C-alpha cells in the first residue's frame, strides 16, 4: 500500500486540470518517497498539499439580477443612495462585458462608513466568496482561503504602504506569477476592491489603474436611522438577547451621538451601542426583567458621563481665535486657529504644521491688513512694532491647506483690534493679497462636520454657492450659510 | 470596453463639445475619457434594466449623466478687477491662466513678493517697477 | 526607609515645577526645570528629544512673550 497513493490518487482527480502545473506536480511527486521521512522527506512533503487545494475550475455561477442586488444593498446599508447607484452601474456594466475589466474600484472615505461592508455585500449579491486581504505592511494565500477561483478580494488598506501593479494590470493580471511557487496563474474572473482614507499615500500609478467612489459620512438624521434599522438590532442579536429585551428612545440615540461620538462614520457609535447591549444583558440574567428601556435620562447609567462638548451653549466668545472648518482624512473637523501679539519686528513666526504652504497664505492675510488699516481700526504703526504668532492645527489635508486664509485673517484682525470672533461661526476660504476670497474644497463634508459639533453660522467663499445644492437637507436646514468674496464681508459677520 | 453596442448609445456633437468646455479644462484628453466612461457606464445600467436598445445623450441630457457643470467657460460671472492681471503661462501641462496681484501698503520703496520664492522674478519685478519709476 | 513621603525635607525652588504625568506605570511626579543663560531668543530643551514638546514649550514661551 504505502501513502504512495493517498495523495497521488486525489492528484489525478478531476481537480488539477491545467498541465502547465501538473508537470511541476508529478515532478516533485515522483521525487524521493525513497526513503522514509528523512529530514529531507518532510520538506517537499508538504509543498504538494498547499498545491492540492488551489482552485482551477470551481466557478461560482454568477447570478446578476439587479432587481435584487440593488435592493439587497438597501437591506444592509441605510443611505448611500448615490454610492449604490454607482455599484449597480458597475454591474449592469458588468453583465454586458462578460469578462471583468481592468478598472477595479476603491472605496474611499473616513473609516466607519461602510467601505468594508459594501464590498462584502457587493459579493453577497454576486454570490462569489469574499476575502479580506489587509495591506498594512501575499495573494498567494488569498485563493486558498476561498478554494474557488472566482472570488472578491478586498485589498483593504492600500495606503498604509511604506509596485505590485502586476496583479491588477488588465494586460498582465491574466498571467500571474509568484516566487516560492513560480507558475503562471489566471485571475480573469476576480472582483477586486480597495478601501482607503487619505487618498494621498496611494501611488499615482495605482490611483489611475483604479476607479474611485467616495463614501461620505452621515447627517445626524442618517446615523440615527442607521442605528435603529441596522446597528442596534445587529448588536442586540449579537449579544444574544431579544428585541423585546431592550429599546432606546430616539432622543437618547441622538444624545449618544451628539455627546459620545464625534466621528463621521459610525464605528464609535456601534461601540457605544454594544456598551449598552452589554450592560443590558447582565440585567436580563440577574434581575431577569424582560425589558430595559434606555432614555435621555438613563443614558449616563449605561455609557458613562458626556464625552464631547456639543454646541456653544457651553462656550464663550474669544479673541484672535477663529474656528475654521477643515477637511480631515476622517471628515469635517473643527480646528481652531490662534494669534498672539508680542512686541518686536514685522516678522511673523507660526507654529503647528511646519507648513511652507501656510506661510504663503499667512503672510497674505497679513499682507492684507498691511493695506486696508485705519479702515479697519488698528494702529498702522503695527507691522513695524509687533510680532505676530499664528497656530494652525494639523489635520487639514494638503489640497485644503490654503482654505484657511479667511481664518488666519479673521484671527489676525480680531487679535490686533481686541475684538472677538463669534464662537458660533465656523469659516473656510482662500485669501489673496488684495483680500479676495477664492473657492474652497469639499464644502459638503465641511458643513456636515460643522453641524456635527453644532455651530450656527458658517461663512464660506461666494463662488462656492453652487456647492450648497448637494448638502443634505437635514444639515443645510440648521445652518445659515454666509457667503463672501472679500475679507471685509467675512470680518463683518464673524466679529462683533 | 463597457461591452455594449454602437447601436446602444450615441452622443450628439454639441454635447461632446459641452462635456469638454464644461467638464474638462485639460490639454490632453484623459479627463475627457473619464467623463465619457461615466456615460458608457450610466448607459449600460439602462441597457440591462430598462433594456431600451438605445440611449441618446444630448446637450440637455448631459446633466443626467455626468453631474452638473464643473468649470466656467467665458467671462459671464467674472467682472473687472484692480491691480490684477491674467497672464498666460506655460505649465508643464499646457497653457494656463495664472493671475498676478499687487497690493499697496504704506512704507518704503522696498517691494516684497510672494508665491514662488523666485530670484528670477525679482529681476523682472524690480524692472516693471523700475519702469514706472521713470515714466510717471 | 527607602522613599521619602512629603515635605518634611524638600524646600521651595525656582523655575522648577512638579508636573503630574501619566507613566505606563501609573501616576508619577516628574519635575520640569528652566535655566537662564545670556544669548538669543532661541530656546533649546533637553531630555526627550520631543518634537511634540517644542510646540508646547514655544507656546508657554509664546505666552510670556505677550502678557509681560
Ligand atoms: N450605511 C450603513 N448601514 C449599516 N451599517 C453600517 C453602515 N455604515 C457603517 N456600518 C457599520 O460598519 C459596518 C460596515 O461599515 P465598516 O465596513 O465598519 O466601515 P469601514 O469599512 O469604512 O470601516 C457595518 O456592519 C456596521 O458595522
UniProtKB/Swiss-Prot annotation, chain A:
GO terms for cellular component: cytoplasm. It is an enzyme of class 3 (hydrolase). GO terms for molecular function: ATP binding; ATP hydrolysis activity; ATP-dependent peptidase activity; sequence-specific DNA binding; serine-type endopeptidase activity. Its main location: cytoplasm. Keywords: ATP-binding, Cytoplasm, Hydrolase, Nucleotide-binding, Protease, Serine protease, Stress response. GO terms for biological process: cellular response to heat; protein quality control for misfolded or incompletely synthesized proteins. ATP binds at residues 109-116. The keyword Nucleotide-binding applies. The active site is at residues 403, 446. It is found in: Cytoplasm. Its EC number is 3.4.21.53. It catalyses: Hydrolysis of proteins in presence of ATP. Induction: By heat shock. The keyword ATP-binding applies. Residues 316-496 form the Lon proteolytic domain. Belongs to the peptidase S16 family. ATP-dependent serine protease that mediates the selective degradation of mutant and abnormal proteins as well as certain short-lived regulatory proteins. Required for cellular homeostasis and for survival from DNA damage and developmental changes induced by stress. Degrades polypeptides processively to yield small peptide fragments that are 5 to 10 amino acids long. Binds to DNA in a double-stranded, site-specific manner. Has been implicated in preventing sigma(G) activity under non-sporulation conditions. Homohexamer. Organized in a ring with a central cavity. Exists as a mixture of small oligomeric species in solution. This is Lon protease 1. It comes from Bacillus subtilis (strain 168).
Amino acid at each position: 500500500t504505502g501513502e504512495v497513493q493517498t495523495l497521488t490518487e486525489k492528484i489525478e482527480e478531476a481537480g488539477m486540470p491545467d498541465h502547465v502545473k501538473e508537470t511541476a506536480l508529478k515532478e516533485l511527486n515522483r521525487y524521493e518517497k525513497i526513503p522514509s521521512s528523512s529530514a529531507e522527506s518532510s520538506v517537499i512533503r508538504n509543498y504538494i498539499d498547499w498545491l492540492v487545494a488551489l482552485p482551477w475550475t470551481d466557478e461560482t455561477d454568477d447570478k446578476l439580477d439587479l432587481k435584487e442586488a440593488g435592493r439587497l444593498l438597501d437591506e444592509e446599508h441605510h443611505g448611500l443612495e448615490k454610492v449604490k447607484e454607482r455599484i449597480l452601474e458597475y454591474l449592469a456594466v458588468q453583465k454586458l462585458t462578460k469578462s471583468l475589466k481592468g478598472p477595479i474600484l476603491c472605496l474611499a472615505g473616513p473609516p466607519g462608513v461602510g467601505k468594508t461592508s459594501l464590498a462584502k455585500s457587493i459579493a453577497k449579491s454576486l454570490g462569489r466568496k469574499f476575502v479580506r486581504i489587509s495591506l498594512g505592511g501575499r495573494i498567494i494565500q488569498g485563493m486558498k482561503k476561498a478554494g474557488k477561483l472566482n472570488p472578491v478580494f478586498l485589498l483593504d488598506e492600500i495606503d498604509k504602504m511604506s509596485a505590485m501593479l502586476e496583479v491588477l494590470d488588465p494586460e498582465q493580471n491574466s498571467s500571474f506569477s509568484d516566487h516560492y511557487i513560480e507558475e503562471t496563474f489566471d485571475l480573469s474572473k476576480v472582483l477586486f476592491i480597495a478601501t482607503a482614507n487619505n487618498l494621498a499615500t496611494i501611488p499615482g500609478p495605482l490611483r489611475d489603474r483604479m476607479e474611485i467612489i467616495n463614501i461620505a459620512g452621515y447627517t445626524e438624521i442618517e446615523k440615527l436611522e442607521i442605528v435603529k434599522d441596522h446597528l442596534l438590532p445587529k448588536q442586540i442579536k449579537e449579544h444574544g438577547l431579544k428585541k423585546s429585551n431592550l429599546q432606546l428612545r430616539d432622543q437618547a440615540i441622538l444624545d449618544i451621538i451628539r455627546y459620545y461620538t464625534r466621528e463621521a462614520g459610525v464605528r464609535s457609535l456601534e461601540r457605544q451601542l454594544a456598551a449598552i447591549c452589554r450592560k443590558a444583558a447582565k440585567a436580563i440574567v440577574a434581575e431577569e426583567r424582560k425589558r430595559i428601556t434606555v432614555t435621555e435620562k438613563n443614558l449616563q447609567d449605561f455609557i458613562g458621563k458626556r464625552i464631547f462638548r456639543y454646541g456653544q451653549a457651553e462656550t464663550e466668545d474669544q479673541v484672535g481665535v477663529v474656528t475654521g472648518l477643515a477637511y480631515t482624512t476622517v471628515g469635517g473637523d473643527t480646528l481652531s486657529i490662534e494669534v498672539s501679539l508680542s512686541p518686536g519686528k514685522g516678522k511673523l513666526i507660526l507654529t503647528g504644521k511646519l507648513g511652507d504652504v501656510m506661510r504663503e497664505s499667512a503672510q497674505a492675510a497679513f499682507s492684507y491688513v498691511r493695506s486696508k488699516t485705519e479702515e479697519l481700526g488698528i494702529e498702522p504703526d503695527f507691522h513695524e512694532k509687533y510680532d505676530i504668532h499664528i497656530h494652525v492645527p494639523e489635520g487639514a489635508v494638503p489640497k485644503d491647506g490654503p482654505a484657511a486664509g479667511i481664518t488666519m485673517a479673521t484671527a489676525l484682525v480680531s487679535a490686533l483690534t481686541g475684538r472677538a470672533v463669534s464662537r458660533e461661526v465656523g469659516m473656510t476660504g482662500e485669501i489673496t493679497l488684495r483680500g479676495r476670497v477664492l473657492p474652497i474644497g469639499g464644502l459638503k463634508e465641511k458643513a456636515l462636520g460643522a453641524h456635527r459639533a453644532g455651530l450656527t453660522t458658517i461663512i464660506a467663499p461666494k463662488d462656492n454657492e453652487k456647492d450648497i445644492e448637494d448638502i443634505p437637507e437635514s444639515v443645510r436646514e440648521g445652518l445659515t450659510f454666509i457667503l463672501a468674496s472679500h475679507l471685509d464681508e467675512v470680518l463683518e459677520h464673524a466679529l462683533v
